[PDB]
Scaffold this active site. Structure first.
Site, PDB file in Angstrom:
ATOM      1  N   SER A  69       0.805  -1.210   0.000  1.00 21.17           N
ATOM      2  CA  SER A  69       0.000   0.000   0.000  1.00 21.17           C
ATOM      3  C   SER A  69       0.841   1.264   0.000  1.00 21.17           C
ATOM      4  O   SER A  69       2.061   1.234   0.171  1.00 21.17           O
ATOM      5  CB  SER A  69      -0.942   0.056   1.190  1.00 21.17           C
ATOM      6  OG  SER A  69      -0.484   1.031   2.109  1.00 21.17           O
TER       7      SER A  69
ATOM      8  N   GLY B 178       2.132   2.963  -2.166  1.00 21.92           N
ATOM      9  CA  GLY B 178       3.209   2.814  -3.139  1.00 21.92           C
ATOM     10  C   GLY B 178       4.570   2.336  -2.642  1.00 21.92           C
ATOM     11  O   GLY B 178       5.623   2.792  -3.097  1.00 21.92           O
TER      12      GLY B 178
ATOM     13  N   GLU C  37     -10.954   2.908  -7.071  1.00 25.96           N
ATOM     14  CA  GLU C  37      -9.889   3.630  -7.781  1.00 25.96           C
ATOM     15  C   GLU C  37     -10.003   3.349  -9.263  1.00 25.96           C
ATOM     16  O   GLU C  37      -9.947   2.185  -9.683  1.00 25.96           O
ATOM     17  CB  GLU C  37      -8.470   3.254  -7.277  1.00 25.96           C
ATOM     18  CG  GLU C  37      -8.293   3.487  -5.761  1.00 25.96           C
ATOM     19  CD  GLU C  37      -6.849   3.303  -5.324  1.00 25.96           C
ATOM     20  OE1 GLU C  37      -6.446   3.461  -4.186  1.00 25.96           O
ATOM     21  OE2 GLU C  37      -6.039   2.927  -6.281  1.00 25.96           O
TER      22      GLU C  37
ATOM     23  N   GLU D  80      -8.100  -0.489  -8.571  1.00 23.44           N
ATOM     24  CA  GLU D  80      -8.203  -1.264  -7.356  1.00 23.44           C
ATOM     25  C   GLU D  80      -9.360  -0.722  -6.521  1.00 23.44           C
ATOM     26  O   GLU D  80     -10.025   0.227  -6.930  1.00 23.44           O
ATOM     27  CB  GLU D  80      -6.861  -1.334  -6.577  1.00 23.44           C
ATOM     28  CG  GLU D  80      -6.387   0.031  -6.026  1.00 23.44           C
ATOM     29  CD  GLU D  80      -5.245  -0.050  -5.029  1.00 23.44           C
ATOM     30  OE1 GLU D  80      -4.830   0.901  -4.381  1.00 23.44           O
ATOM     31  OE2 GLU D  80      -4.739  -1.262  -4.909  1.00 23.44           O
TER      32      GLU D  80
ATOM     33  N   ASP E 119      -8.196   7.143   1.992  1.00 24.87           N
ATOM     34  CA  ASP E 119      -7.559   8.381   2.424  1.00 24.87           C
ATOM     35  C   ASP E 119      -7.928   9.586   1.584  1.00 24.87           C
ATOM     36  O   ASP E 119      -8.171  10.658   2.127  1.00 24.87           O
ATOM     37  CB  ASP E 119      -6.031   8.293   2.559  1.00 24.87           C
ATOM     38  CG  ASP E 119      -5.308   7.823   1.322  1.00 24.87           C
ATOM     39  OD1 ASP E 119      -5.778   7.597   0.211  1.00 24.87           O
ATOM     40  OD2 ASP E 119      -4.051   7.677   1.609  1.00 24.87           O
ATOM     41  N   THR E 120      -7.988   9.416   0.261  1.00 24.18           N
ATOM     42  CA  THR E 120      -8.325  10.550  -0.610  1.00 24.18           C
ATOM     43  C   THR E 120      -9.713  11.107  -0.281  1.00 24.18           C
ATOM     44  O   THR E 120      -9.995  12.284  -0.570  1.00 24.18           O
ATOM     45  CB  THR E 120      -8.207  10.225  -2.122  1.00 24.18           C
ATOM     46  OG1 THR E 120      -9.256   9.301  -2.453  1.00 24.18           O
ATOM     47  CG2 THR E 120      -6.794   9.708  -2.460  1.00 24.18           C
TER      48      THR E 120
ATOM     49  N   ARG F 271       2.069  10.820   7.409  1.00 26.76           N
ATOM     50  CA  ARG F 271       1.020  11.819   7.300  1.00 26.76           C
ATOM     51  C   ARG F 271       0.561  12.078   8.719  1.00 26.76           C
ATOM     52  O   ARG F 271       0.005  11.191   9.394  1.00 26.76           O
ATOM     53  CB  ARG F 271      -0.147  11.267   6.484  1.00 26.76           C
ATOM     54  CG  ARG F 271      -1.328  12.191   6.200  1.00 26.76           C
ATOM     55  CD  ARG F 271      -2.208  11.568   5.159  1.00 26.76           C
ATOM     56  NE  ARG F 271      -2.833  10.230   5.523  1.00 26.76           N
ATOM     57  CZ  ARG F 271      -3.205   9.228   4.731  1.00 26.76           C
ATOM     58  NH1 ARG F 271      -2.932   9.262   3.451  1.00 26.76           N
ATOM     59  NH2 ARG F 271      -3.809   8.165   5.223  1.00 26.76           N
TER      60      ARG F 271
HETATM   61  N1  LIG Z   1      -1.119   0.432 -14.275  1.00 25.10           N
HETATM   62  C1  LIG Z   1      -0.963   1.631 -13.909  1.00 25.10           C
HETATM   63  N2  LIG Z   1      -0.831   2.641 -14.819  1.00 25.10           N
HETATM   64  C2  LIG Z   1      -0.635   3.991 -14.569  1.00 25.10           C
HETATM   65  N3  LIG Z   1      -0.574   4.481 -13.353  1.00 25.10           N
HETATM   66  C3  LIG Z   1      -0.722   3.518 -12.392  1.00 25.10           C
HETATM   67  C4  LIG Z   1      -0.909   2.146 -12.585  1.00 25.10           C
HETATM   68  N4  LIG Z   1      -1.010   1.499 -11.365  1.00 25.10           N
HETATM   69  C5  LIG Z   1      -0.872   2.494 -10.472  1.00 25.10           C
HETATM   70  N5  LIG Z   1      -0.647   3.716 -11.028  1.00 25.10           N
HETATM   71  C6  LIG Z   1      -0.351   4.998 -10.373  1.00 25.10           C
HETATM   72  O1  LIG Z   1       0.266   4.742  -9.149  1.00 25.10           O
HETATM   73  C7  LIG Z   1      -0.626   5.090  -8.019  1.00 25.10           C
HETATM   74  C8  LIG Z   1      -0.578   4.093  -6.859  1.00 25.10           C
HETATM   75  O2  LIG Z   1      -0.868   2.766  -7.373  1.00 25.10           O
HETATM   76  P1  LIG Z   1      -1.554   1.707  -6.404  1.00 25.10           P
HETATM   77  O3  LIG Z   1      -2.863   2.276  -5.982  1.00 25.10           O
HETATM   78  O4  LIG Z   1      -1.851   0.432  -7.142  1.00 25.10           O
HETATM   79  O5  LIG Z   1      -0.588   1.447  -5.147  1.00 25.10           O
HETATM   80  P2  LIG Z   1      -0.984   1.010  -3.627  1.00 25.10           P
HETATM   81  O6  LIG Z   1      -2.052  -0.066  -3.772  1.00 25.10           O
HETATM   82  O7  LIG Z   1       0.246   0.404  -2.998  1.00 25.10           O
HETATM   83  C9  LIG Z   1      -1.407   2.301  -2.851  1.00 25.10           C
HETATM   84  P3  LIG Z   1      -2.670   2.446  -1.950  1.00 25.10           P
HETATM   85  O8  LIG Z   1      -3.351   1.053  -1.522  1.00 25.10           O
HETATM   86  O9  LIG Z   1      -2.298   3.194  -0.704  1.00 25.10           O
HETATM   87  O10 LIG Z   1      -3.691   3.272  -2.681  1.00 25.10           O
HETATM   88  C10 LIG Z   1      -2.004   5.214  -8.655  1.00 25.10           C
HETATM   89  O11 LIG Z   1      -2.949   5.886  -7.780  1.00 25.10           O
HETATM   90  C11 LIG Z   1      -1.614   5.781 -10.040  1.00 25.10           C
HETATM   91  O12 LIG Z   1      -1.257   7.164  -9.931  1.00 25.10           O
HETATM   92 MG   LIG Z   2      -3.708  -0.492  -2.816  1.00 26.42          MG
HETATM   93 MG   LIG Z   3      -4.323   2.943  -4.659  1.00 27.68          MG
END
Ligand SMILES: Nc1ncnc2c1ncn2[C@@H]1O[C@H](COP(=O)(O)OP(=O)(O)CP(=O)(O)O)[C@@H](O)[C@H]1O
Ligand SMILES: [Mg+2]
Ligand SMILES: [Mg+2]
Ligand SMILES: Nc1ncnc2c1ncn2[C@@H]1O[C@H](COP(=O)(O)OP(=O)(O)CP(=O)(O)O)[C@@H](O)[C@H]1O
Ligand SMILES: [Cl-]
Ligand SMILES: [Mg+2]
Ligand SMILES: [Mg+2]
Ligand code: NA
Ligand code: NA
Ligand code: NA
Lengths: 389, 389
Positions: B159, B161, B264, B276, B283-284, B360
């Site tokens: 999560s 990133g 998302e 996802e 959070d957003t 944060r």
């Molecule tokens: N296939 C893809 N193409 C383009 N951008 C992507 C992408 N997958 C993710 N992103 C970008 O990266 C961001 C974070 O990706 P992701 O949501 O999958 O990570 P995460 O699951 O670890 C974070 P979290 O659960 O906190 O939201 C996205 O909100 C988007 O800006």
């Molecule tokens: Mg995620």
């Molecule tokens: Mg995400």
């Protein structure tokens, strides 16, 4: 303004003196800013205690007890929820360096009708009902004579209408005088003439670093010494509004200190009459939990913490309606809730541990296209909740 | 729907599994309804614990630990705030009769990218980026070759990133894979094709007794695993909004149970692609703390308690901006607060006990006549806060 982190050494500490539903929302607003909250009351599990970091049960009327808890907790702010506190000790503590919200003087003048009445009427030269103070039945009798009928009699130490009497006839005098010696402390009174106003409002006025700002006028319906419904904004003449604000400003500035004040006024045409003022959030103002960007509780916190208000946004016709059942129980449940919530409609359930008679256990909140519809929406929802014992 | 009184024998009990700032709001909303709250996490003094009736600290990934606490507190609802929890035990408990919000399966599917991606893309046939899973460096390389450049590699269990790399060329292969092994269970990765979207949104979707409701689209800006600013409403064409809603509806229903979900999505003019989903507040979505009558937290609570949503009010352009400092301290303070709040401007300070790098610690919130102006106002405010420790 510097805030620490709750529970940490540099935490900013707020002590709540009174943990009712009003205090409960202030606690929430403090929590939202990571402010450490210590909730105090005369009974366990008071609503604000549910959401505080910790709490204490003490006799707040007992100054030595007050001093002890304060000293124990070393709060940065002492925030009273009610009148019933050892204000003399507050004065002392303030004199010793404590920050009493809005100020200790404010809390003392307001816990005594004489104090406040004189200030407004005399000192401030403000419009109020005719009145007289009396230390004896003879004088009482005398005063009622001077005021005429009908008239209202209240202990100089009364709230929620406690120990008060509406007088139209001489026959009530024995009981009236007795009722008066009865409530409050249990011995001095006030005899006010009766005002024939179009409506009553609560002008929620916040005194902060950026000055005094007002919330839109809150109208309300009182019944058996309890507000039943409140709404905003209450329709009033520009002139009338203007006069109400003047009065409110003069009063809050005169009481002093930062915080939200509940200025009670009567309106008759373009004419405004000062009734009294709460040096803190007012029950009627619970409508602001749905009617404004900043609730009266949030405004209170913003103000006391020395932060600027800037502006208050009002979201159209809104109303609150109390959930005031009457029964005896220590295990209250609420059914049919699904018919008390929906679009533009919310409810709050206080967490009060027990009831033994008439008690405010929650409130319904609604918004609508008209104040009248807002009121109905809120009333109806409050009425759908089935309170079980 | 029947609710008891917190702390009383008939109390309605909610157990929070994860006590972060999102859970904190959920707790406040539960408390507003007199719901009894037990906050659980892996560290003490976590934000939600500040406003809970009781707190416990355990290994939430330990199924037995989980069962123990559950047996001890006997909550009616178990509300997870994070992905990292003993999902198999939640399933067990849900069978043993516990209400897992929104449902145990939804939690199992979303704890790892594989369950959720395969469900959406394969079972539901929703549009998503191209993807390939890999459990070895070599399988990782074969995946990239098939997916093509650029691509993004992410650990299946992550999560905010963590351990992700935006791969533009083979140069990065080695590092990418290492970094990916750093994030998670510390194994399996997902390799996704890069979607070129005009913008991304979080569609806050509520599955309730009275159906599926949608909050106005929330736009957001990501920077290094963390959302930085969010705003609402995000403008989208009618066609894109409808396709986004169809996708969101399908996913929530497929996941099952009542609650608010953070869907998302990537928007490409009139086309929408599924990324996802959080089976809980996102959070957003904190922008809703100022932008709606009912925040995403109030909505989650209303939905999971089995109450009808009715509808959601959106007050106009608004934004959120994080307070994300970087330092190491166990006694963080916030100064210059008088310059971070004001007209149509608020802040929230989470109460997090400590920091050791970037975390944060709060959020600034603002409203304005346009999302652009709100964003500026909120960023500026977040920036005014002087974080020291
Ligand atoms: N296939 C893809 N193409 C383009 N951008 C992507 C992408 N997958 C993710 N992103 C970008 O990266 C961001 C974070 O990706 P992701 O949501 O999958 O990570 P995460 O699951 O670890 C974070 P979290 O659960 O906190 O939201 C996205 O909100 C988007 O800006
Ligand atoms: Mg995620
Ligand atoms: Mg995400
Ligand atoms: N002089 C007066 N003329 C007309 N109505 C009056 C009056 N004094 C009081 N009332 C009515 O009675 C209500 C309660 O009066 P008051 O404000 O003095 O009670 P209180 O101090 O005991 C309760 P509280 O402090 O909670 O407001 C007012 O809101 C108004 O409806
Ligand atoms: Cl695959
Ligand atoms: Mg009074
Ligand atoms: Mg009054
Ligand atoms: Na003060
Ligand atoms: Na507590
Ligand atoms: Na369930």
């Amino acid at each position: 303004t510097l805030l620490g982190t709750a529970l940490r050494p540099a935490a900013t500490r707020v002590m709540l003196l009174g943990s009712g539903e009003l205090g409960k929302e202030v606690a929430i607003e403090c929590q939202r800013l990571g402010v450490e909250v210590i909730a105090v009351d005369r009974y366990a599990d008071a609503p604000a205690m549910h959401v505080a970091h910790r709490s204490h049960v003490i006799n707040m009327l007992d100054g030595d007890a007050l001093r002890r808890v304060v000293e124990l907790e070393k709060p940065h702010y002492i925030v009273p929820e009610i009148e019933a506190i050892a204000t003399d000790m507050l004065i002392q503590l303030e004199e010793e360096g404590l920050n009493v919200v809005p100020c200790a003087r404010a809390t003392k003048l307001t816990m005594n009708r004489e104090g406040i009445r004189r200030l407004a009427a005399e000192e401030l030269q403000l419009p109020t009902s005719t009145y007289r103070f009396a230390d004896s039945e003879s004088l009482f009798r005398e005063a009622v004579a001077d005021i005429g009928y009908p008239c209202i009699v209240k202990p100089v130490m009364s709230s929620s209408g406690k120990g008060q009497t509406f007088i139209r006839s001489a026959e009530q005098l024995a009981q009236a005088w007795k009722y008066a010696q009865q409530g409050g402390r249990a011995g001095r009174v006030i005899v006010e003439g009766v005002v024939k106003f179009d409506f009553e409002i609560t002008l929620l006025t916040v005194s902060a670093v950026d000055g005094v700002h007002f919330c839109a006028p809150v109208g309300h319906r009182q019944e058996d010494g309890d507000y039943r419904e409140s709404w905003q904004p209450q329709q009033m003449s520009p002139l009338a509004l203007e006069r109400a604000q003047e009065i409110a400003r003069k009063v809050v500035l005169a009481l002093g200190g930062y915080g939200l004040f509940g200025v009670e006024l009567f309106v008759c045409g373009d004419e405004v009459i000062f009734s009294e003022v709460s040096p803190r959030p007012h029950d009627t103002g619970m409508v602001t939990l749905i009617s404004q960007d900043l609730s009266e509780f949030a405004l209170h916190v913003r103000a006391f913490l020395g932060l600027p208000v800037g502006g208050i946004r009002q979201y159209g016709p809104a109303a609150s309606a109390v959930i005031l059942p009457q029964l005896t129980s220590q295990n209250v449940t609420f059914d049919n809730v699904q018919n008390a919530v929906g679009a533009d409609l919310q409810i709050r359930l206080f967490g009060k541990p027990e009831i033994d008679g008439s008690r405010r256990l929650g409130v319904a909140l609604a918004t609508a296209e008209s104040v009248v519809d807002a009121i109905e929406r809120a009333k109806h929802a409050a009425g759908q909740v089935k309170v079980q014992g």
